[PDB]
C-alpha cells in the first residue's frame, strides 16, 4: 500500500559549493560528489522537500556513500506538515556510518488518525566524525497519496 512519493527541493539552510541540495535525488554511492553538504555545521541546518501531492508520509530512506564518511548524519530529526511554516516532529534518530541504505518509519498518526504532509524538513544535528559540514547522499520518501485515503484525513 506504500509507494514512492516524488518530491522537489524547496528550501535549504545553506550548501557548500558543488554539493547542491538536488544531489539527494540521485543514488550514486560510488560518487563522493553526489550529496548535499551544508555550508557549515552551525545550527540550524536543514533541507525542506515539497511533495508533488499531499500524502500520508510513512517512511524515509537514506542512501549512503560506498564507504564510511565523517559527514554522515550521526543524529538527525525529520519534521513535516501540510504548511511549510508549521510542522510537527516525525522522527528523531541517527544513521549508521556504513554503506547500507536505511529506512525509518515516520510518525504519521495522532490517536490512530492518519495525517497528511506536503512538506518534509530534514534537520541534520551531528556528524559521525570531525567535520565542518553535514552531508546527505540520497533521500526517498514513501507512503500514501491515494486521494481516497488522503482526502478523508484532511481537515474541513
Contact residues for 19 (Cβ-Cβ < 8 A; gap 6+): 33, 35, 36, 37, 133, 135
Placement of cell 547500507 in the chain? 100
What is the longest distance spanned by two Cα atoms in the chain?
49
Method: X-ray
HEC secondary structure over the chain: CCEECCEEEEEECCCCCCCCHHHHHCCCCCCCCCCEECCCCCCCCCEEEEEEEEEEEEEEEECCCCCCCCCCEEEEEEEEEEECCEEEEEEEECCCCCCCCEEEECCCEECCEECCEEEEEEEEEEECCCCCCCEECCEEEEEECCHHHHHHHCCC
Resolution in A: 1.5
The total of other beta-carbon atoms located within 10 Å of residue 68's CB is 13
Rounded to whole angstroms, the Cα distance separating 132 from 129 reads 9
77: its cell numbers:
530529526
The total of other beta-carbon atoms located within 10 Å of residue 114's CB is 16
Between the alpha carbon of residue 131 and those of residues 39, 94, 110, 127, the distances in Å are 11, 16, 37, 7
Placement of cell 518530491 in the chain? 7
Contact residues for 51 (Cβ-Cβ < 8 A; gap 6+): 5, 6, 7, 57, 117, 118, 119, 120, 141, 145
Contact residues for 84 (Cβ-Cβ < 8 A; gap 6+): 10, 11, 48, 50, 118, 119
Placement of cell 516532529 in the chain? 89
Nearest to 113 by CA among 155, 66, 156, 54: 155
Nearest to 4 by CA among 151, 155, 144, 156: 144
Right CATH for 1-156 from 2.60.120.260, 3.40.190.10, 3.40.350.10, 3.20.20.10: 2.60.120.260
Amino acid at each position: 500500500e506504500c509507494r514512492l512519493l516524488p518530491y522537489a527541493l524547496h528550501k535549504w539552510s545553506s550548501f557548500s559549493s558543488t554539493y547542491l541540495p538536488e544531489n539527494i535525488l540521485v543514488d550514486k554511492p560510488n560518487d563522493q560528489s553526489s550529496r548535499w553538504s551544508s555550508e557549515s555545521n552551525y545550527p540550524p541546518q536543514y533541507l525542506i522537500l515539497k511533495l508533488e501531492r499531499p500524502a500520508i508520509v510513512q517512511n524515509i530512506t537514506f542512501g549512503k556513500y560506498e564507504k564510511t564518511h565523517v559527514c554522515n548524519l550521526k543524529k538527525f530529526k525529520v519534521f513535516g506538515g501540510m504548511n511549510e511554516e508549521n510542522m510537527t516532529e516525525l522522527l528523531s534518530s541517527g544513521l549508521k556510518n556504513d554503506y547500507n541504505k536505511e529506512t525509518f518509519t515516520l510518525k504519521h498518526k495522532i490517536d490512530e488518525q492518519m495525517f497528511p504532509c506536503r512538506f518534509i524538513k530534514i534537520v541534520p544535528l551531528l556528524s559521525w566524525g570531525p567535520s565542518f559540514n553535514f552531508s546527505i547522499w540520497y533521500v526517498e520518501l514513501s507512503g500514501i497519496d491515494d486521494p481516497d485515503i488522503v482526502q478523508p484525513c484532511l481537515n474541513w
